[PDB]
Amino acid sequence: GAMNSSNYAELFNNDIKLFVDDTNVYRVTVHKTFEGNVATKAINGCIFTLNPKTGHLFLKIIHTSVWAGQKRLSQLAKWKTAEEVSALVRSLPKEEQPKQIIVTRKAMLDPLEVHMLDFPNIAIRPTELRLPFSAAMSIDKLSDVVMKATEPQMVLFNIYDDWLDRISSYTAFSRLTLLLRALKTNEESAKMILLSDPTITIKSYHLWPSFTDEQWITIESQMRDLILTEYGRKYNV
Amino acid sequence: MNTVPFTSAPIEVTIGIDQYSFNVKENQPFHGIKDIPIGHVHVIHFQHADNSSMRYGYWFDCRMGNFYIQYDPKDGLYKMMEERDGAKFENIVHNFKERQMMVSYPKIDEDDTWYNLTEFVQMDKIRKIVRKDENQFSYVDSSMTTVQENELSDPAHSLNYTVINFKSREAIRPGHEMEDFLDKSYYLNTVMLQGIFKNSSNYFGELQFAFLNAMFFGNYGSSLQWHAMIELICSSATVPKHMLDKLDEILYYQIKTLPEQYSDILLNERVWNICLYSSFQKNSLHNTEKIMENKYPELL
Ligand SMILES: O=C(/C=N/C(=O)c1ccccc1)NO
C-alpha cells in the first residue's frame, strides 16, 4: 500500500527499493512574446531516482530536446519518467533490481505500472509523505550538471557523501530530508547556513560540506530553526 | 409461440420471464408460461419468497428443444430440464393449456424492448460463457464469480467472460505504453475485435449478456464485465462508426430498462462520467447521454 509515517523504517531494511521523484522532469520558464501573449521555454530537467538505504542517486538528465514537437508535455513527462525508470531497472543485474519502487506523486503510479508490466514482482507504491525531493535542484552540483547537459545523460551521485561511514541510513535519510526541506522552504537562508564558514569545504567528490559530527548537529539544529521560522513568517506565529 | 410448462409450484416464488415477472403462491395451481416469442433467447428466473437470497435462473432458446421446470425438493430449487419425448411434451402442454393453468408471455405489440436488449445474444455464445455442455440451457445465479474474479474458486461454476484488463501485456504493446494506455483502439480493434471476438456482433452479445446477468441476478462480476466492455470502446479513439451508433442504441435500452431503484449499485459513476464526458467518444452516445442525464442526473 501507500507509504506513510507508520511504516517509515521499511525504507532502511534490506529489500532494495527506489524512490522516484518526477517533479523536475519538465521545467519551464514562462515569458511574454513580442505579441504580448505568453509562452513557455523548456529547460533541462532530471528524474530523481534514489536508493534510501545506500544513498545512490541515479540522476537521469532530461534534455529539452526530448520535448521537441510533442504535445501535452506535463502528461508526456510522467510517461517519459516511467520509461526512463523502466530502462534503468532493465539495465541493472537481477540481484540489483528494486523489489519496490515508491513514487513521490500518485500521478506516476499508472505510467510506471504500465511500463513495468514485465516486472510483476516489483511493487509500485505511492506515499503520503510530503518529501522534499523537488529541492534536489537547489543542490549546486546537481543543478550544474543538469543545466550544462547538451544531450540526454545519466549522472550518478551518492547523495549521502561519506555519511554512512559514521551514521545509519535512517539518520542519513533524515538529515537529507531536513536539508532538502530547508532548501525548499528558504533556499538562501539554507545555503547561507551550509556555507557560512569558509573553512568547511565540499570535497570535489561530494555534494555537501565536510562537517564533523558536532558541526552536523549544529547545522541540523539551524535547519530546524529555519524551518520553524519560515513557518511562522508564513503563518504569522 | 412456445411453452415452458412447470410440473408444479410447491414453494412460493417470484418468477421472472425476460423483463416480466409475477408472483406464484405456495402450491398455487401454476403450470408454466406460454406464447413465448420464438426467435430470441430468453431467461426464466426465480426468487423464493422465503430466501430472497440467490436470484437464479436459466437462459434458453425454445428452438433448441422442449424445456420444462420442476421443483427439486432435495436441492431446493426450480430446475430446468429437457423433455426428449416430443409427443409426451406436446400432450403435457396441450392438457395444461386446455385447463388454462399457464401465464401468457405478455408482449405488447409495439414493444421491441427484449429484442433490443438481446439483439446480439446467441445461445451458442452463452453456453461458452456458462460451461455445462450436457444441457442446452444455461444456469446463472447471483453468486457465480467470473474467470477474472477467480484470478484475483470453483471453476466449473464460473462465468467465463472474456478477460479485459487495461493494465496487462495483452492490452499494451511494448514501446507503445503511453499510446496504448491512453488510447485503447489497438486493444479494442486488433486484440479483442479481430483477435478474440472476431466481429462486433459477438462483442456486443457478450456485453448485452453481462448487462442482463447483472440486472436480473445482481451478479457483480457481470456488472464489472459490462462496464469494462463499455469503457474499452469509450476509451478507444478509433472505433468504426457503425459500432458507436449501435453501442448508443444498445446502452440506451439497457439504461431505459434498468429499475430506477437499482441504479445505485448497477451503475459505476466513474465509468459513466468518464465515458459520457471525458472519453474520446464523449460526443458519440447521444441517445445514451440524453436518457442518462434525464433519468440518473444524480450519478453525473
Ligand atoms: O563504489 C561504491 C559506491 N557506489 C555509489 O555510490 C553509486 C552511486 C550512484 C549509483 C551507483 C553507485 N560502493 O561503496
Swiss-Prot record, chain A:
Q: What is the effect of changing T23A?
A: Reduced growth at 30 degrees Celsius. Strongly reduced growth at 16 degrees Celsius
Cell location? Nucleus
Outcome of mutating R105K, per the record? Answer: Severely impaired growth. Reduced growth at 30 degrees Celsius. Strongly reduced growth at 16 degrees Celsius
- Cite the residue spans of the region called RNase H homology domain: 7-237
The residues that cross the membrane are none
As for what it does, the entry says: Functions as a scaffold that mediates the ordered assembly of spliceosomal proteins and snRNAs. Required for association of BRR2 with the spliceosomal U5 snRNP, and the subsequent assembly of the U4/U6-U5 tri-snRNP complex. Functions as a scaffold that positions spliceosomal U2, U5 and U6 snRNAs at splice sites on pre-mRNA substrates, so that splicing can occur. Interacts with both the 5' and the 3' splice site, as well as the branch region. Has a role in branch site-3' splice site selection. Associates with the branch site-3' splice 3'-exon region. Also has a role in cell cycle.
Record note on quaternary structure: Component of the U4/U6-U5 tri-snRNP complex composed of the U4, U6 and U5 snRNAs and at least PRP3, PRP4, PRP6, PRP8, PRP18, PRP31, PRP38, SNU13, SNU23, SNU66, SNU114, SPP381, SMB1, SMD1, SMD2, SMD3, SMX2, SMX3, LSM2, LSM3, LSM4, LSM5, LSM6, LSM7, LSM8, BRR2 and DIB1.
Cite the domain annotation text: The MPN (JAB/Mov34) domain has structural similarity with deubiquitinating enzymes, but lacks the residues that would bind the catalytic metal ion. Contains a region with structural similarity to reverse transcriptase, presenting the classical thumb, fingers and palm architecture, but lacks enzyme activity, since the essential metal-binding residues are not conserved.
One further remark on this entry is: Present with 468 molecules/cell in log phase SD medium.
Q: What is this protein called?
A: Pre-mRNA-splicing factor 8
The record lists the organism as: Saccharomyces cerevisiae (strain ATCC 204508 / S288c) (Baker's yeast)
In the UniProt record, the gene name given for this protein reads: PRP8
In terms of the parent sequence, the fragment covers 1836 to 2069 of 2413
Swiss-Prot record, chain B:
By its UniProt entry, which Pfam families does this protein fall under?
AAR2, AAR2_1st
Write out the ranges of the annotated region (Leucine-zipper): 244-265
For this chain, the Swiss-Prot or TrEMBL PTM comment says: Phosphorylated on serine and tyrosine residues.
Q: Which UniProt keywords apply?
A: Cytoplasm, mRNA processing, mRNA splicing, Nucleus, Phosphoprotein
- In-chain residues carrying the UniProt-annotated modification Phosphoserine: S236
Outcome (variant: S236A): No effect on interaction with PRP8
Record protein name field: A1 cistron-splicing factor AAR2
